[PDB]
């Protein structure tokens, strides 16, 4: 079969349930902290310590 016949490649299952929703929720946390850092250094800023 290694020369004559052929096959088909789908190649991406990735269906690991808890791992999937870990990916999604971790990404949501990322976008949270990203926009936080952005408007953090963007707008009027007051701190918790001095100069953070």
């Amino acid at each position: 079969x290694x020369x004559x016949x052929x096959x088909x490649x789908x190649x991406x299952x990735x269906x690991x349930y808890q791992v999937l929703r870990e990916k999604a929720a971790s990404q949501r946390r990322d976008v949270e902290r990203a926009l936080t850092r952005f408007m953090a250094k963007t707008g009027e800023t007051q701190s918790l310590f001095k100069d953070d």
Binding site: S26, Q27, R28, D30, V31, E32, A34, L35, R37, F38, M39, K41, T42
Partner: protein, 329 residues
Amino acid sequence: KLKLSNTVLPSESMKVVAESMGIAQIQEETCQLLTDEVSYRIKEIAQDALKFMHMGKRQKLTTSDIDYALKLSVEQQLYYKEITEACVGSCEAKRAEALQSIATDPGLYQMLPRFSTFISEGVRVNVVQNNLALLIYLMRMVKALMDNPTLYLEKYVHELIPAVMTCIVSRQLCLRPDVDNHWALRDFAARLVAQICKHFSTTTNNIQSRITKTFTKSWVDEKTPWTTRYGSIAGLAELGHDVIKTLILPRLQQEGERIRSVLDGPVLSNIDRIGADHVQSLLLKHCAPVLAKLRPPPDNQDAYRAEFGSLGPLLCSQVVKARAQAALQ
């Protein structure tokens, strides 16, 4: 466009009204012609009363008018919103802070497809609009996309590469003067090109071949404006060492004669004049070191003879400068 049929009352009901007085047995066509004639008189008196009240100047007909006529999620697009708005607005600290944001993002993707799509179509817009500030904004945006050590940029690169290289095109359609150097600043963008290909010629090997054929068809021909030739030379320049050694060396002298024809003849295409001038700047102050490696550093005037005069001896002078820069360590 309009059809005014005769509004004819049904003759059987007219025979009912007639035989209420008890006349006779009546045929149909008599009552039909009676309804016709009475309808003509009604519509004529109606035309008369409409002429009255369009000289009485009201669009309504009262009883008295005809009586006188009887005198006969969320945060995805939130983040997207403010980072695009900072990408467009010139708040310069917020500009640079957005750039360091994108550069320092753990796990910013899935915004990446919309991101790049915006980059592509805003590039097309500002090609039509010729706003260099937005162009360097988008190029810094691409630079920031490049500098994530998380962003597997791979699958989307096919949108960036037009959006890159079209910025190395446009048909000289800005204002002239300073934009030339801004064309040089677009060569900054050309730096990005090499900073693409080092990470992305990993293909079933496609990318470098593609871009270099593109620059080749750019570089060779005539009917080629100075934007095109200049930026193509810039992209090959950013591709580096043996690109220049193999590819720019051959028709070096012929395009030098093209500039020599731009030299010494007419005057008032100063777009084209200063264009070819900082073309010469690109050629000399990027193409010196490969000859400094190859051609041994005697014989400056002969190197001018070996490389069509004009680059020499500033070729050899810059070669002396480059040998000094090498020996400076």
